[PDB]
């Protein structure tokens, strides 16, 4: 059943909630922008995407406002960093690849699950929102899918490692907010599977095969 978006109880879960989610796209903006000092020929399609996430995150901010929700910004920054610190020393390295797995394909599949999951259990106004992000997000391939798939195998094992390092944040990062994600009516299960497979999905475009994939996702425990 819908949750109650009145009570104080989910007035509270959807301060970190939404906060976490304005976050998120905020940072995208600047990890796109960032990727486009890696990749110089790529600069005018990152700036349409980076304009996008400031569009999404205009619409999650009104979200927030239309419940009478102040976002917590402070747990939102904290939330995320230890996923932005990995970014910036990838970024510091021009490491393009591993940049490339924690916005474009592990931070997006962590959207995509989030908002697919949040939907049927969301009020009228940010129902429309979420439905808006999704049926809108990206093109068939994705900035990083299109560009990891071209340059695979001189960065293979550079993949590998960025999966090993970051997989087991993004699966801390969810059982941070599953206790908030609940009283939101959202099932912790649906998130993990959702995330997986469309993780599954990218890895597979990108031309990973079944035994590859299997021991990226076990990278997660
Ligand atoms: C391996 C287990 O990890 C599964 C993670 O499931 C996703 C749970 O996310 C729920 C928290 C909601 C936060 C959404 C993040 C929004 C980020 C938007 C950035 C856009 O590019
Ligand atoms: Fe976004
Ligand atoms: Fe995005």
């Given at each position: 059943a ?8 989910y ?9 976490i ?15 486009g ?8 399609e990152?700036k ?13 901010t ?12 402070d ?8 996923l932005?610190?990995?970014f910036?020393t990838?970024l ?6 591993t940049?490339?797995?924690?916005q474009?394909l ?44 071209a340059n695979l ?8 490692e ?5 997989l ?8 941070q907010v ?17 995330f997986?497979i469309?993780?599954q999905?990218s890895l597979?475009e990108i031309?990973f ?13």
């Open positions: 819908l949750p109650d978006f009145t009570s104080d109880r007035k509270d879960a959807y301060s970190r909630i939404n906060a989610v304005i976050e998120g796209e905020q940072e995208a903006h600047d990890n796109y922008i960032a990727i000092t890696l990749l110089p020929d790529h600069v005018e990152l349409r995407l980076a304009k996008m996430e400031m569009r999404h995150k205009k619409g999650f009104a979200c927030g406002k239309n419940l009478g929700v102040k976002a917590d910004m747990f939102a920054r904290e939330f995320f960093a230890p932005r610190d990995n910036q990838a510091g390295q021009g490491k393009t690849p940049c490339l797995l924690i474009a592990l931070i997006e599949a962590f959207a995509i699950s989030a908002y697919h999951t949040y939907i049927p259990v969301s009020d009228p106004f940010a129902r429309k929102i979420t439905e808006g992000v999704v049926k809108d997000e990206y093109t068939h391939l994705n900035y990083g899918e299109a560009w990891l798939k195998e001189s960065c293979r094992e550079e993949l590998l960025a999966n090993r390092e970051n087991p944040l993004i699966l801390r990062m969810l059982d599953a206790g908030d994600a609940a009283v939101l009516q959202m099932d912790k299960e649906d998130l993990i599977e959702d997986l469309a993780y999905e597979t031309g095969n079944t035994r590859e994939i299997t021991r990226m996702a076990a990278a997660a425990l």
